[PDB]
């Protein structure tokens, strides 16, 4: 089977400028498990990014949380870049900062 990832990009806590927080990229619903996930700051790859241990849902599709500690500001742009066998090109999803 081949299933494309769902992607959510979001902060752990309500975002306030100058206050430390965590940036999350949650990838789920995908198969096979091989996947490439990076967090971006102003289009550039963030070096210190950790992730959860691979697990899966009732339908066998995989999920992973990628995350980094960060301090948001007025100007800095954040996004998550995901590559998977189901994608013809890497998918970029921007942090919307909605909550």
């Amino acid at each position: 089977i081949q299933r494309t990832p769902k992607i959510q990009v979001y902060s752990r806590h309500p975002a306030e400028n100058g206050k430390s927080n965590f940036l999350n990229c949650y990838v789920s619903g995908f198969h096979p498990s091989d996947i490439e996930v990076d967090l971006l700051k102003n289009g550039e790859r963030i070096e210190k990014v950790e992730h959860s241990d691979l697990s899966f849902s009732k339908d066998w599709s995989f999920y992973l949380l990628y995350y980094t500690e960060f301090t948001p500001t007025e100007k800095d742009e954040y996004a998550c870049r995901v590559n998977h066998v189901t994608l013809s090109q890497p998918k970029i999803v921007k942090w919307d900062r909605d909550m």
Binding site: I1, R3, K6, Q8, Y10, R12, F22, N24, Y26, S28, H31, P32, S33, D34, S52, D53, L54, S55, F56, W60, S61, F62, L65, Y67, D98, M99
Partner: protein
């Protein structure tokens, strides 16, 4: 109810070497152990403070068992390649999940043991713990083998006995978190779409366990149209987040209410802009 679940993924590496094997253990929505074949320790590792209570005998035993599990999955990948007449060149995936639930009475409720190959159902132990659901003729071969070897009977002994005893032990040892509900912290946001329309978003943050229901009503009646409900997502600190949204005519925000149901809320909450 409460649950203990173990999840196992093995992925073959036809270019070089043995399969990538990852095992994770959960009590409810809390991960408590891990094993990764690519990690340095080659031990079952703790992932919650309450399991670090367990002594060296526990960690040696779980390491021995999880390594045995790893080897079984390596062999399985070989076996399944043979059953399906596949070449050695391709990468393939096996997944296995098993575990038990205790009910509200703290007694055994249900047991599970199921398997997938390349993301498709392969074989699953039925709820009676005495029969098998084999998806195709490869799994039928496994079914015949497992029936002759009385596998269901061996698994049932674990699932009804040892499994629930482990779960109860963990629930007590980790009760400060495992038996604490974190009620959702809720609020609403307003997003203008046009001069005439606006999106109301109802937020549920920092909740545990992950199970939650967010519903919209208009004038006290349910509404699915012009709504959006995102998949529940991990906050990263062990709690979860979710939101629901509804598009409404500007000036009619008062008509709409978001209703939140969760185990940590004695009665469901209502939000209104």
């Amino acid at each position: 109810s409460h649950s203990m679940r173990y999840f196992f993924t093995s992925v073959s590496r036809p270019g070089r070497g043995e399969p990538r094997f990852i095992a994770v253990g959960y009590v409810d929505d809390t991960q408590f152990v891990r094993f990764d074949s690519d990690a340095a320790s080659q031990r079952m590792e703790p992932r919650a403070p309450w399991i670090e209570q367990e002594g060296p005998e526990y960690w040696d035993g779980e390491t021995r068992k999880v390594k045995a599990h790893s080897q079984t999955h390596r062999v399985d990948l070989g076996t399944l390649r043979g059953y399906y007449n596949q070449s050695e060149a391709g990468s393939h995936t096996v997944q296995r999940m098993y575990g038990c639930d205790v009910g509200s009475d703290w007694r055994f409720l249900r047991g599970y043991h199921q398997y997938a190959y390349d993301g498709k159902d392969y074989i699953a132990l039925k709820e009676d713990l005495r029969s098998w659901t084999a998806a195709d003729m490869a799994a039928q071969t496994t079914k015949h083998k497992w029936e002759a070897a009385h596998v269901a009977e061996q698994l049932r002994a674990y699932l009804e006995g040892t499994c629930v005893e482990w779960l109860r032990r963990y629930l007590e040892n980790g009760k400060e978190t495992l038996q604490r509900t974190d009620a959702p912290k809720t609020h609403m946001t307003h997003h203008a779409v046009s001069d005439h329309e606006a999106t109301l978003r109802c937020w549920a943050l920092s909740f545990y366990p992950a199970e939650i229901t967010l519903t919209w009503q208009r004038d006290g009646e349910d509404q699915t149209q012009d709504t959006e409900l995102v998949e529940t997502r991990p906050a990263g600190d062990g709690t979860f987040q979710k939101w629901a949204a509804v598009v409404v005519p500007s000036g009619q925000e008062q008509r709409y209410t978001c209703h939140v149901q969760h185990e940590g809320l004695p009665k469901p909450l209502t939000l209104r802009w």
